[PDB]
Ligand binder design. Structure first.
Ligand SMILES: *[C]C1=C([C])[C]=C2C(=[C]1)N([C][C]([O])[C]([O])[C]([O])[C]OP([O])(=O)OP([O])(=O)O[C][C]1O[C](N3[C]=NC4=C3N=[C]N=C4[N])[C]([O])[C]1[O])C1=NC(=O)[N]C(=O)C1=N2[C]([O])[C][N]C(=O)C1=[C][C]=C(Cl)[C]=[C]1
Ligand SMILES: *[C]C1=C([C])[C]=C2C(=[C]1)N([C][C]([O])[C]([O])[C]([O])[C]OP([O])(=O)OP([O])(=O)O[C][C]1O[C](N3[C]=NC4=C3N=[C]N=C4[N])[C]([O])[C]1[O])C1=NC(=O)[N]C(=O)C1=N2[C]([O])[C][N]C(=O)C1=[C][C]=C(Cl)[C]=[C]1
Lengths: 499, 494
């Protein structure tokens, strides 16, 4: 029944919020819909895989909050394999390369590719992390899909193809589904294009030893019986002195404050009294999550390494079920595995098939891309379709269709009386990641601490010391990369000498 | 507890479904979240207005199902006033006109305006009413916003302005918010541009005497205690022999079948066991409703008539709070009133103001457009912001953002085990209107009748005889309108 704060949702954001409040002396209860904690992170354990992340998995430099929390919980990280060559598969042929970016040899194509990535970052510099709708051209950029932006910027099909894959991979949505403003904000708040796509020195550098699901499981261990599993919240009442929170199985909880630590659209599953303010009421119907199937194919050995391939494949084309892979072998060199994402509309299309049918398609693709018959001999297969999850709605995160961020964005983390909002979608740095979940959870908790007169307003948004274990190298640009003209810029330079 | 069918939602769709099933001999229960029936229709009664529709209101020719249902319930219609001239207000000036369409005098602009409306209808002819995702260019048109389509088609700012207002008014959403495929489907399934925008011979021809809320109230009268008010459904369980439906106030209902007669996205308010199939699970997060405030300003007399204005105003520009008005005077000539819509992003912007502040803005606008100081002296004001409604989500209807209709559209009225789907959003003719609500409700009811072996498959989709009271004139095009070139067509000819 009675406590200081009810946290709705037991993912990383909710658990982190509850941990901070618990550590401050407050009585907290976490209400979780599922029979487990972790939400969009899920570690499966069986004898064939030992452990495997079927949801959120990768951490990297600049993600200092998730690194600190996990370290405090006694977790270790290890480096994702990027010793050997990456592969870019384009028009049925594989091109091995090193470094973060696939190489381009055609000089026109090179100018186009260089200008695209640069423009994304240039446009991002105009967007405040904490308030994207305050960008000078906010409305113009928000009334545009990423597809429209790509059509205007990319003068070659090759750049357009790669930019499209980039959008699909970062936000599990089609370029035509998402707002240009939102996507440009999304990349900037992760530290830019290079940081977001990189393994070494980027978002995919590392995983947790034993899986990322341990983050939530271990906070549950600290909180004990304060975490209530299989308690989906159906009803929040704010008309009286104390807030009343009801669950599906008819339990009632009373608190001074509530943290909502669920994806914004899943707020729709709760009936509110009094009704939500108009803007939030409509916002939560306008913010879907992306579509993805995460698939892991297991092999006897990491045979791609013998061919000097790290296991990273960037795969172009409509025919390919998977557009991106990474080596998912354990740090000890055993349980050899390839992790692949089936993205956006392909997740929808290929969900109709059986498990066995999807395994076949993947093996045949990997055999092609890696040039190895060994890819046709899997020892085990695991997969998870996040689109089917009632209490997630999809993965990785919430995307904003055109027109929404400028109209409703302000409302995302605006408190509704005594309900405060966490969840990775409300973060300002690495929103959509486990990092952002920690940021939002701890910020929401501190908003409540301020409301109770326990901390000054100054202390609601706290910065994070850099990790000593996972330090960040700065992102550099060459002189050529900064000053080489665009395609239309080169063409303008031709029309001027001819006068 | 026990019955044959639980209907979730007591709007027109739910009530119509329940009526049909009840008339067939089945035991039905309607579970309604609000303390009233009618949903997106709501008639307010007080001494100052007598009655006024604050939600769905207009009916017209080709809407034969809502007309028949209402007639059976003992309702009458009357004609919306369109005797005098319409007004097009453009760049701070009023242009009186007659007929459905605002006149254009510049020849280049004329060609551009003609080509736009014609193209909309040409494109619509390629889209099947019952399956828009089966259009030959479905994916291409679905991956585009209406804003993109307008940018490509309209060579003049004048056509683009009017096309934009048209989109805002039909679907209470911005051109950049909506899929081109979905919007072109939407217009076609209402019978085309002319049918959808017309008062005389169109969707806005008539209202019900006493209000449209009587449709739902009177079906509730017929059903008696079978309608349960303030019973929001929170939980549907399909794992056992009979379907279990739970409400917020802890009541349990058992049935063989369920009709979901709520806006698709409001399905999110229900927890399902087992979980929904993947496609429906994601669909219901991708389908928002538009934004609108309906406002009615009352006057001593319908003074605009003395100036030979019917009361219809089509008002261009960002500054104008209201883009469209109609005469809302009672058929007897009293309770003089102007109905206006505050659309899309303007609903959001102007919701921050007080009631009195909105009234002032409207009166000053109407004074400008109608050219009368009499507009500055309102006797009464009524309004409703549909954006704030927990159990509606907005108004008039569900719109589809780019990419959604081709990916998830198939799933809209696909049965989930023993749950069947009604609601105006699942209709194939006048979806988004009271007409479509009737179509969908009765179709969903018949799907269940077929599932029980009571009717043949042949009988699930029934056609409707034309109303003798409100007959439809056909939509005609002149030779010139059909064959006059576009702007780029004229330039190609040069
Ligand atoms: C799914 C996914 C996947 C597959 C993958 C991934 C991901 C995902 N990610 C993301 C993450 O995971 C997230 O963000 C997190 O987790 C979040 O958290 P939060 O905020 O907390 O949320 P959640 O989890 O969801 O939780 C919630 C909770 O609550 C609950 N509920 C609901 N409802 C309700 C409830 N309760 C009561 N009542 C009611 N009503 C639920 O149940 C839950 O529990 C990510 N992340 C990171 O960090 N990393 C990673 O890795 C990840 N992932 C991916 O990988 C990503 N990727 C990307 O992006 C990329 C790649 C590559 C390149 Cl080159 C670039 C980019
Ligand atoms: C709002 C609105 C307005 C303002 C206006 C209008 C409208 C609207 N409309 C539409 C109609 O109204 C609709 O469609 C109908 O109503 C629908 O129905 P349904 O389908 O049945 O649905 P609803 O109503 O919503 O119902 C539902 C129910 O359910 C319930 N719930 C929820 N949730 C729940 C429940 N329960 C239990 N549980 C749970 N969970 C609720 O509560 C409800 O009750 C329209 N219509 C027609 O027909 N007409 C008209 O008039 C209308 N309106 C407008 O006016 C339109 N306009 C247009 O569009 C235009 C104008 C001008 C031109 Cl030129 C063109 C166009």
């Amino acid at each position: 029944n009675k406590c200081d704060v009810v946290v709705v949702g037991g993912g990383i954001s909710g658990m982190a919020a509850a941990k901070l409040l618990h550590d401050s002396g407050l009585n907290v209860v976490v209400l979780e819909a599922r029979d487990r904690v972790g939400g969009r992170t899920y570690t499966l354990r069986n004898q064939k895989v030992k452990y495997v992340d079927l949801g959120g998995s990768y951490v990297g430099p600049t993600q200092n909050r998730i690194l600190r929390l996990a370290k405090e919980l006694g977790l270790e990280t290890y480096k994702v394999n990027e010793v050997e060559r990456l592969i870019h598969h384009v028009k049925g042929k594989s091109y091995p390369f090193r470094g973060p970016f696939p190489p381009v040899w055609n000089p026109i194509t090179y100018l186009d590719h260089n200008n695209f990535w640069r423009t994304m970052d240039d446009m991002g510099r105009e967007i405040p992390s904490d308030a994207p709708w305050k960008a000078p051209l906010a409305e113009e950029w928000d009334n545009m899909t990423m597809k429209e932006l790509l059509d205007k910027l990319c003068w070659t099909e090759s750049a357009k193809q790669l930019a499209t894959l980039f959008v699909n991979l970062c936000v599990t949505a089609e370029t035509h589904e998402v707002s240009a403003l939102w996507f440009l904000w999304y990349v900037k708040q992760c530290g830019g294009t290079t940081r977001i796509i990189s393994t070494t020195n980027g978002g995919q550098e590392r995983k947790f030893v034993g899986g990322s699901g341990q983050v939530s499981e271990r906070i549950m261990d600290l909180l004990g019986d304060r975490v209530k599993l299989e308690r989906p919240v159906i009803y929040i009442d704010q008309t009286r002195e104390n807030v009343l929170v009801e669950t599906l199985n008819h339990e009632m909880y009373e608190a001074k404050y509530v943290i909502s630590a669920i994806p914004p659209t899943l707020g729709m599953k709760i009936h509110f009294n009094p009704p939500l303010p108009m803007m939030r009421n409509q916002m939560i119907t306008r913010v879907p999550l992306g579509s993805v199937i995460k698939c892991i194919v297991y092999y006897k050995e990491p045979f791609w390494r013998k061919k000097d391939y790290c296991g990273t494949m960037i795969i172009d084309g409509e025919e390919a079920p998977v557009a991106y892979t990474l080596d998912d072998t354990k740090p000890e060199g055993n349980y050899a595995a390839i992790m692949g994402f089936i993205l956006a509309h392909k997740a929808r299309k290929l969900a109709r098939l059986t498990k066995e049918e999807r395994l076949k398609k993947l093996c045949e693709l990997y055999a092609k891309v890696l040039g190895s018959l060994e890819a046709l001999e899997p020892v085990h297969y695991e997969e998870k379709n996040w689109c089917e999850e009632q209490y997630s709605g999809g993965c990785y995160t919430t995307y904003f269709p055109p027109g929404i961020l400028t109209q409703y964005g302000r409302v995302l983390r605006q408190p509704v009386d005594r309900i405060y909002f966490a969840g990775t979608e409300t973060a300002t740095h690495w929103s959509g990641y486990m990092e952002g979940a920690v940021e939002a959870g701890e910020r929401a908790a501190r908003e409540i601490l301020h409301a109770m007169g326990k901390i000054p307003e100054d202390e609601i948004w706290q910065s994070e010391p850099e990790s000593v274990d996972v330090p960040a190298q700065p992102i550099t640009t060459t002189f050529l990369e900064r000053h080489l003209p665009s395609v239309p810029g080169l063409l303008r330079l031709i029309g001027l000498t001819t006068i």
